[PDB]
Scaffold this active site. Structure first.
Site, PDB file in Angstrom:
ATOM      1  N   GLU A   1       6.696   2.803   7.037  1.00 52.18           N
ATOM      2  CA  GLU A   1       6.978   4.127   6.486  1.00 52.18           C
ATOM      3  C   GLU A   1       6.929   5.208   7.553  1.00 52.18           C
ATOM      4  O   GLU A   1       7.832   6.018   7.658  1.00 52.18           O
ATOM      5  CB  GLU A   1       5.980   4.472   5.386  1.00 52.18           C
ATOM      6  CG  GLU A   1       6.065   5.916   4.890  1.00 52.18           C
ATOM      7  CD  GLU A   1       5.242   6.138   3.637  1.00 52.18           C
ATOM      8  OE1 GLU A   1       4.999   5.149   2.920  1.00 52.18           O
ATOM      9  OE2 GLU A   1       4.843   7.292   3.355  1.00 52.18           O
ATOM     10  N   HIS A   2       5.869   5.212   8.351  1.00 53.50           N
ATOM     11  CA  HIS A   2       5.760   6.143   9.448  1.00 53.50           C
ATOM     12  C   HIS A   2       6.880   6.003  10.444  1.00 53.50           C
ATOM     13  O   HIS A   2       7.118   6.923  11.224  1.00 53.50           O
ATOM     14  CB  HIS A   2       4.494   5.891  10.203  1.00 53.50           C
ATOM     15  CG  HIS A   2       3.299   6.544   9.608  1.00 53.50           C
ATOM     16  ND1 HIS A   2       2.717   7.668  10.156  1.00 53.50           N
ATOM     17  CD2 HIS A   2       2.571   6.236   8.506  1.00 53.50           C
ATOM     18  CE1 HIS A   2       1.691   8.028   9.412  1.00 53.50           C
ATOM     19  NE2 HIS A   2       1.573   7.166   8.412  1.00 53.50           N
TER      20      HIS A   2
ATOM     21  N   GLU B   1      -4.741  10.016  10.053  1.00 46.41           N
ATOM     22  CA  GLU B   1      -4.567  10.042   8.600  1.00 46.41           C
ATOM     23  C   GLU B   1      -5.776   9.389   7.916  1.00 46.41           C
ATOM     24  O   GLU B   1      -6.202   9.829   6.849  1.00 46.41           O
ATOM     25  CB  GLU B   1      -3.233   9.362   8.180  1.00 46.41           C
ATOM     26  CG  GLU B   1      -2.186  10.356   7.702  1.00 46.41           C
ATOM     27  CD  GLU B   1      -0.744  10.019   8.092  1.00 46.41           C
ATOM     28  OE1 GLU B   1      -0.072  10.850   8.765  1.00 46.41           O
ATOM     29  OE2 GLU B   1      -0.262   8.973   7.674  1.00 46.41           O
TER      30      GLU B   1
END
Ligand code: HEM
Ligand code: HEM
Ligand code: AY1
Lengths: 105, 446, 53, 378, 60, 79
Positions: free
Chosen positions: B60-61, B137
């Site tokens: 995703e990143h 994160e």
């Protein structure tokens, strides 16, 4: 307005004087049993009423202890007896009943 | 006067199409000038293993960081300049990448999705940069008591199974995952029969199909030999995790019971009972007078700051329960009350409260499906989970079926005398012992 | 003035706890019986006749 | 820091009679709570000294008591204080319950109810008490009464013989009663504390039924000394009996030992059961008589469910005030009839008094209440 | 075909009603059967009773 | 339990009081005493007294008729 309506009023004025709280300076509403509804209405009184009610009841409890009463000219004159708590008590009861009614469906 | 029943009939049918890839292509047309398209992948972290955990998250990143035909900026620059919105997310079971855009921009919208989903570059220098952002994160996520406790609920309830894992992974994986780890998860999982091109707005289904066939053809031109992505069922465990920390000002607790899972018809009824209990927050107006007995008691006696029931679904299993937040001396009361309510419903659901619950749920449903994005997401996700799209009307029929008896029967089936999975965090000294919480899952009167 | 409890919901609440209240009387009867060795009632139960030939 | 407040023990004592806020307002009718307490301990105290000399065994029962009265140094004052304190314990119990109805105190459900439990127990105790000396009244008193359970359908017989230890009153019955007469006052004493526990939850009611929160005084000075004086008065009375009129309230025939052959046409329970006695036999029924006897006391637990008035005390309620006294006098009637033989006038009048009692508490007072509401416009 | 214990839980242990009903129903039969087997065991290991002594005195 | 300081709310009342060592324990004991008990007796005779005389009347008539029922019994038995 009747000749006999004054009679009912007369029986009432009679009971009032007999009931006797007026000799202690109380007002009819100063003598109601405190229950939830009554407690809530006591809560809703504006400062001055509440303060006056406190002073009254203090004055009676005080008299009651000395087992005295007020001079006759200072007793609570029926008809000058303000029903200061009825409207709140009545409103507190209405809302309870609405609840009670909602709980049925 | 156009009735509610009738209104449900007016909602246009979701059109479904299958390519030769096995890629399902679905849409719901409306008069809107904008829209939402994207691909829903049957890929999560329940699909991962001890060692590649966080891979999906790591992808995703990278998904927007550059493709072969569009390196680095490129993507952003195409999306941003056309005034669109590019977004994505991933849970334990699903992954999605959607684009909000002017509906006249459906052609490039889709093109971009394909490229993203197919030709994700994964430039090594990026993988390194991203490694350090995800680490960060994690420090960040560590401060959201709520995010924490829900990971703990999952960690304990599903102990020893993949579902017990978190989406982002443990730090070491993020520290250790390699490009080879990634691409192999990609090819392993980004295969047509597990992807769903979804869209909602001012499009026509044919135009969508054309695009899907133009930019998506050739994904499963190779149906795999013996790679059998099958989900093993996940054990549930009546267990409890308490992360005591008297340095936090408020405690979070999350209690759940094993749920049935996405496809079980029992969901509808459970959702009704949940609606009955509902949720609460200290900024709700109307305190004492709330219909939810729990909520009203919590508000009058200041039992908490916030609570909320929930019903998480995964394949064949799920967490069903409530999560709350409160002061250190209220954890006991909140629990009592929460549990007493669960039992009341198992054994004494009255008729009207169920109507309210049903109406709440109808409101919720209809309200939730408002706008291109929320709809598009429901299409794509539902195709994954139900295999089809359940037309509003059908849900309305399912809800209508429910009444007190169904609630008591359905609640008892999942809550009555069942073993909870408890997760605690914060000043939890007063959080009741597991035995005690367990005992609260039955009534000696009944 | 027990009229506060007269309505549809109460009627449903009452009915829900009918099986419980019933089974709870079954527990008490049998319980009273077994505890006082109720000669009358017990004679009827097949076994448990510790007063026969 | 004041140890009188933080020490686990004193707390209790501070809360009991030192710092506890009480109405600046209560009057003599509130003394009978200390008096009952005093009664309870003094009873426990003389009662114990008699037990160091008493016996049991039907043969020696009567003999031991006389032994005490004549031989035991000072045994007489002890014996008579015990027997007279027993009556005083009823006068107060009676007055207490009286104070209670008049003033509406019964609105404290738990407290009132514990008090009813306190009533039955001291009754049950004092009953067993007089069986002990094994006199004539003791034997048939112990017989006429106990039997009543024989009116209970289907199992009455079984129970009355189970409580007896035989087929009549003898051996098994005197020892039994002594032991029960010994353990009960301790149990009562516990119950009393729970009674008092629930009382502290609301504090005391007062002559006006209003609410004294606006004018509370510390139990310190005030009610401690007004309890002392009071107790002195209770001593005067108890001593007046013991020292001047020892048998004035005592049936002279509990002297002269037992005799299952006799039965002296007269026989009535001790004065404090007369009103109850009257009720029971003012009914031509074994079941009804005893059923009515029970209701006669168990009705106290019914009173709160028939509070109808919008005011709490009867201080401002002439109508009810009248029905209250009519109740008292009527109880004084039942007491008097109970004391008479079941013959001509006495029957029909005691039969009327019974009906009155139940009709007054069950219909008259509750209606008087509603009319007063209506008169006041409430 | 589930389990004995399983089937047992569903039909009788789940509800505290039936749960309790089961034990009062189960205590009655237990008191009887345990008193039989017990006394029997007590006699079998004895036999200088007044039981086997009676056979001799049915007369007077 | 309830302590002073947490009882209830009181507005504007002054209370003057005096040391016991500074006043009399029996101000006007008889002077003001008697008149007052007359006053309280008067105030209550009518609700307390009536039921008692009723009992009083029924008590004297009741025993009367009890003796005159048997003792008086003979009476006449003439033949
Ligand atoms: C073991 C015998 C009893 C003892 C030792 C006892 C002790 C007390 C004490 C110390 C008080 C506070 C002082 C007072 O108000 O006089 C009291 C008040 C009270 N008792 Fe009892 N009592 C006994 C029997 C009863 C009975 C027979 C009743 C009624 C069935 C009763 C119900 C009450 C109630 C309602 C109050 C509150 C009085 C008020 O607030 O004005 N107790 N008792
Ligand atoms: C646990 C402390 C008590 C003990 C140890 C005790 C023990 C005794 C004993 C041994 C007798 C027989 C001696 C005699 O008759 O004078 C007796 C008589 C009696 N006591 Fe108690 N008792 C106690 C508490 C009570 C209580 C709570 C009452 C109820 C007010 C009570 C009322 C009586 C009565 C009515 C009699 C018989 C009456 C009479 O003497 O003519 N005593 N007691
Ligand atoms: C041992 C002596 C220490 C006293 C502690 C126990 C005794 C106790 O608790 O003391 C206080 C004094 C208690 N209340 C009162 O007296 C009382 C309360 C309001 C008003 C008045 N009077 C006049 O308005 C009172 O007199 C009371 O009087 O209850 C007794 C029954 C109890 O006695 C008991 O429990 C027995 C079970 C011991």
């Amino acid at each position: 307005v009747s000749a006999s309506s004054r009679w009912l009023e007369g029986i009432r004025k009679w009971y009032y004087n007999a009931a006797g709280f007026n000799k202690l300076g109380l007002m009819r509403d100063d003598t109601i049993h405190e229950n939830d509804d009554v407690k809530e209405a006591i809560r809703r009184l504006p400062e001055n009423l509440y303060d006056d009610r406190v002073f009254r009841i203090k004055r009676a409890l005080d008299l009651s202890m000395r087992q005295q009463i007020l001079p006759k000219e200072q007793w609570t004159k029926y008809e000058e007896d303000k029903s200061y708590l009825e409207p709140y008590l009545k409103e507190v009861i209405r809302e309870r009943k609405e609840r009670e009614e909602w709980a049925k469906k | 006067t156009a009735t509610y029943a009738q209104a449900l009939q007016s909602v246009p049918e979701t059109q479904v199409s299958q390519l030769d890839n096995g890629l399902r292509v679905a849409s719901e047309q409306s008069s809107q000038p904008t829209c939402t398209v994207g691909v829903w992948i049957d890929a999560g972290s329940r699909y991962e293993s001890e060692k590649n955990n966080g891979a999906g998250y790591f992808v995703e990143h990278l998904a927007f960081k550059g493709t072969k035909n569009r390196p680095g900026n490129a993507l952003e620059k195409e999306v941003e300049s056309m005034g669109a919105h590019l977004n994505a997310y991933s849970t334990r079971e699903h992954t999605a990448y959607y684009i909000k855009a002017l509906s006249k921009d459906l052609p490039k919208a889709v093109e971009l999705l394909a490229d993203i989903v197919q030709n994700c570059s994964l430039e090594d220098s990026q993988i390194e940069k991203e490694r350090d952002v995800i680490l960060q994160e994690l420090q960040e996520n560590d401060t959201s008591m709520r995010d924490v406790v829900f990971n703990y609920l999952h960690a304990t309830a599903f102990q020893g199974t993949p579902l017990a894992q978190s989406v982002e992974g443990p730090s070491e994986n993020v520290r250790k995952l390699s490009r080879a780890d990634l691409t192999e998860y990609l090819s392993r999982h980004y295969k047509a029969p597990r992807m769903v091109l979804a869209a909602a707005g001012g499009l026509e289904h044919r135009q969508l199909l054309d695009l899907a066939q133009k930019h998506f053809s050739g994904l499963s031109g190779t149906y795999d030999e013996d790679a059998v992505p099958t989900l093993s069922p996940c054990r549930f465990t009546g267990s409890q995790i308490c992360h005591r920390e008297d340095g936090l000002p408020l405690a979070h607790v999350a209690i759940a019971v094993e749920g049935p899972g996405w496809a079980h018809p029992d969901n509808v009824a459970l959702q009704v009972a949940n609606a009955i209990i509902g949720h609460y927050d200290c900024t709700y107006g109307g305190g004492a007078h709330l219909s939810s007995p729990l909520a009203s008691i919590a508000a009058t006696n200041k039992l908490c700051q916030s609570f909320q029931t929930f019903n998480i679904c995964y394949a064949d299993t799920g967490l069903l329960g409530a999560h709350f937040v409160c002061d250190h001396m209220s954890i006991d009361d909140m629990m009592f009350v929460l549990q007493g309510q669960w039992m009341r419903l198992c054994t004494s659901a009255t008729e009207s409260e169920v109507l309210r619950g049903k109406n709440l749920l109808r409101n919720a449903l209809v309200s939730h499906l408002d706008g291109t994005t929320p709809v598009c997401e429901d299409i794509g996700r539902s195709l994954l989970t139900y295999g089809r799209r359940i037309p509003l009307a059908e849900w309305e029929s399912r809800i209508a079926e429910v009444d007190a008896r169904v609630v008591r029967e359905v609640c008892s089936k999942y809550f009555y005398d069942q073993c909870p999975a408890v997760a605690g965090f914060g000043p939890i000294e007063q959080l009741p012992d597991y035995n005690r919480i367990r005992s609260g899952m039955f009534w000696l009167r009944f | 003035m027990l009229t506060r409890f007269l309505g549809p919901r109460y009627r449903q609440l009452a009915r829900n706890w009918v099986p419980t209240a019933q089974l709870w009387g079954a527990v008490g009867a049998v319980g009273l019986v077994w505890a006082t060795d109720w000669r009358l009632i017990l004679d009827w139960v097949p076994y448990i006749n510790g007063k026969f030939k | 820091t004041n140890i009188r407040k933080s020490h686990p023990l004193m707390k209790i004592v501070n809360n009991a009679f030192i710092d506890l806020p009480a109405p600046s307002n209560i009057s003599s009718w509130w003394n009978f709570g200390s008096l009952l307490g005093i009664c309870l301990i003094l009873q426990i105290l003389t009662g114990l000294f008699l037990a160091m000399h008493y016996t049991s065994d039907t043969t020696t029962a009567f003999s031991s008591v006389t032994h005490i009265c004549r031989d035991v140094n000072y045994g007489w004052i002890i014996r008579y204080m015990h027997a007279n304190g027993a009556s005083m314990f009823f006068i107060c119990l009676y007055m207490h319950v009286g104070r209670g109805l008049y003033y509406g105190s019964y609105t404290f459900l738990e407290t009132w109810n514990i008090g009813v439990i306190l009533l039955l127990t001291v009754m049950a105790t004092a009953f067993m008490g007089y069986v002990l000396p094994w006199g004539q009244m003791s034997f048939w008193g112990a017989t006429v009464i106990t039997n009543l359970l024989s009116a209970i359908p289907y199992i009455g017989t079984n129970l009355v013989e189970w409580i007896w230890g035989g087929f009549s009153v003898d051996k098994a019955t005197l020892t039994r009663f002594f032991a029960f007469h010994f353990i009960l006052p301790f149990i009562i004493m516990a119950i009393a504390m729970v009674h008092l526990l629930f009382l502290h939850e609301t504090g005391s009611n007062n002559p006006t039924g209003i609410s004294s929160d606006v004018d509370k005084i510390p139990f310190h000075p005030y009610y401690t000394i007004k309890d002392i004086l009071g107790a002195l008065l209770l001593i005067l009375a108890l001593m007046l009996l013991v020292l001047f009129a020892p048998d004035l309230l005592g049936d002279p025939d509990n002297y002269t030992p037992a005799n299952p052959l006799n039965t002296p046409p007269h026989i009535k329970p001790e004065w404090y059961f007369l009103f109850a006695y009257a009720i029971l036999r003012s009914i031509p029924n074994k079941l009804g008589g005893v059923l009515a006897l029970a209701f006669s006391i168990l009705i106290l637990a019914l009173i709160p469910l028939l509070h109808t008035s919008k005011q709490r005390s009867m201080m401002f309620r002439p109508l009810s005030q009248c029905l209250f006294w009519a109740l008292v006098a009527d109880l004084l009637t039942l007491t008097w009839i109970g004391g008479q033989p079941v013959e001509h006038p006495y029957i029909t009048i005691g039969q009327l008094a019974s009906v009155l009692y139940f009709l007054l508490i069950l219909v008259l007072m509750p209606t008087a209440g509603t009319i007063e509401n209506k008169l006041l416009k409430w | 075909a589930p389990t004995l214990t399983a089937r047992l839980y569903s039909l009788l242990f789940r509800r505290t009603s039936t749960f309790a009903l089961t034990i009062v129903v189960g205590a009655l039969f237990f008191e009887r059967a345990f008193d039989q087997g017990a006394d029997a065991i007590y006699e079998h290991i004895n036999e200088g009773k007044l039981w086997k002594h009676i056979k001799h005195k049915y007369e007077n | 339990g309830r302590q002073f300081g947490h009882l209830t709310r009181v507005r504007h009342v002054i209370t003057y009081s005096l040391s016991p060592f500074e006043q009399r324990a029996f101000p006007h004991y008889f002077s003001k005493g008697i008149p007052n008990v007359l006053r309280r007796t008067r105030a209550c005779i009518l609700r307390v007294a009536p039921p008692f005389v009723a009992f009083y009347l029924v008590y004297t008539w009741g025993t009367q008729e009890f003796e005159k029922s048997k003792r008086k019994n003979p009476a006449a038995y003439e033949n």
